[PDB]
Amino acid sequence: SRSKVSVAPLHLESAKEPPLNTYKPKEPFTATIVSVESLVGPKAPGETCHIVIDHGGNVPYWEGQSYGVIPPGENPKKPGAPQNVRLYSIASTRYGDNFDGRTGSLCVRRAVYYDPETGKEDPSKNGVCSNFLCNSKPGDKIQLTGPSGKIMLLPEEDPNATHIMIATGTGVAPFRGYLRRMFMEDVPNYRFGGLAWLFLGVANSDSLLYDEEFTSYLKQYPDNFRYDKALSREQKNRSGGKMYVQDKIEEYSDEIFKLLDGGAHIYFCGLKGMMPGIQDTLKKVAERRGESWDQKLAQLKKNKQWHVEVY
Numbered sequence: 304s305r306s307k308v309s310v311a312p313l314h315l316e317s318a319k320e321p322p323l324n325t326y327k328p329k330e331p332f333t334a335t336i337v338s339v340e341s342l343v344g345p346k347a348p349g350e351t352c353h354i355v356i357d358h359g360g361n362v363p364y365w366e367g368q369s370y371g372v373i374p375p376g377e378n379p380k381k382p383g384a385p386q387n388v389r390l391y392s393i394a395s396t397r398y399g400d401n402f403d404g405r406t407g408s409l410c411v412r413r414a415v416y417y418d419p420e421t422g423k424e425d426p427s428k429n430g431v432c433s434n435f436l437c438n439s440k441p442g443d444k445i446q447l448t449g450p451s452g453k454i455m456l457l458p459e460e461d462p463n464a465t466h467i468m469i470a471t472g473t474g475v476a477p478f479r480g481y482l483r484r485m486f487m488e489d490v491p492n493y494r495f496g497g498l499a500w501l502f503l504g505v506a507n508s509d510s511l512l513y514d515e516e517f518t519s520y521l522k523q524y525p526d527n528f529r530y531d532k533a534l535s536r537e538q539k540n541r542s543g544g545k546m547y548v549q550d551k552i553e554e555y556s557d558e559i560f561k562l563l564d565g566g567a568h569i570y571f572c573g574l575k576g577m578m579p580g581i582q583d584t585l586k587k588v589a590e591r592r593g594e595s596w597d598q599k600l601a602q603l604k605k606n607k608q609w610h611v612e613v614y
């Protein structure tokens with residue numbers, strides 16, 4: 304038959320620039336929720352849900368962009384005004400999880416408030432949008448704006464490029480969309496033959512997102528995909544205790560450096576807190592090799608190989 308899944312409609316490949324701000328906060332598009340499911344097991348430190356939204360083909364986007372969601376209610380402190388937009392990286396390709404160009408998906412972590420001292424939850428302090436999203440049911444309506452963002456657009460000019468993707472938590476979102484486009488979908492004008500390497504840091508095994516899907520690519524494209532995970536509460540003492548994404552990158556430092564020197568693109572997405580550890584690690588690796596990380600970084604920025612979207 305063939306292994307790549309047919310997608311439609313192919314005219315979504317014809318746009319020359321990505322859509323931007325098609326819908327704005329004062330006049331959002333009203334979309335409809337198709338499904339909401341929890342992505343994590345019982346031991347995860349909090350729920351992360353996968354939400355499929357039907358935009359009916361009216362809010363097209365490119366991989367790596369974000370949708371804005373305006374939760375219902377009035378702005379806590381903007382009397383008579385609407386809630387502010389919250390941005391969520393789109394976790395699906397432009398054809399979406401049903402391969403028909405009508406839906407987009409979000410990967411949303413519930414922001415729950417607990418009294419540090421008493422460990423007591425206080426729902427009045429919970430994050431509004433994230434809980435509204437993971438509480439949704441099929442048929443509920445959502446106000447969408449966007450799409451927004453250009454930083455995380457996938458450079459496709461070289462179908463054989465190297466892409467090293469580093470995520471923590473929900474930062475995996477854009478990468479699920481890149482990888483389906485590279486490996487799962489039958490897109491005639493984009494036939495990937497390079498190397499895609501995904502590093503994913505989470506709390507533990509039960510907190511892994513889309514692991515089954517990424518694991519499958521290992522078995523189908525052993526020569527074009529690599530996947531490494533770091534569980535911060537279930538793995539390895541390196542040069543200090545427990546496992547973070549930086550530790551894994553350290554483990555493969557020579558390869559990574561080699562790839563970066565050859566033109567690889569490198570991407571970071573997820574919680575902003577992941578950045579300092581990573582940068583300390585890269586500096587230390589460079590130093591061991593007798594290189595200046597500062598200079599290398601300036602070069603990667605100049606050549607446009609460095610892509611970061613953290614929040």
Ligand SMILES: Cc1cc2nc3c(=O)[nH]c(=O)nc-3n(C[C@H](O)[C@H](O)[C@H](O)COP(=O)(O)OP(=O)(O)OC[C@H]3O[C@@H](n4cnc5c(N)ncnc54)[C@H](O)[C@@H]3O)c2cc1C
Nearest residue numbers: 389390391392410411412414428429430431432433473614
């Ligand atoms: C480009 C971009 C991409 C993003 N992509 C994703 C993504 O893919 N997935 C995702 O899950 N998130 C993503 N985010 C984050 C997302 O936009 C929201 O910031 C996040 O979901 C929390 O919004 P919320 O409305 O739930 O919380 P808000 O209601 O905005 O509250 C923010 C925080 O304040 C805490 N808080 C609220 N009130 C109080 C109080 N009174 N006292 C103490 N603490 C309080 C809340 O519990 C919460 O943690 C992204 C952000 C950006 C900028």
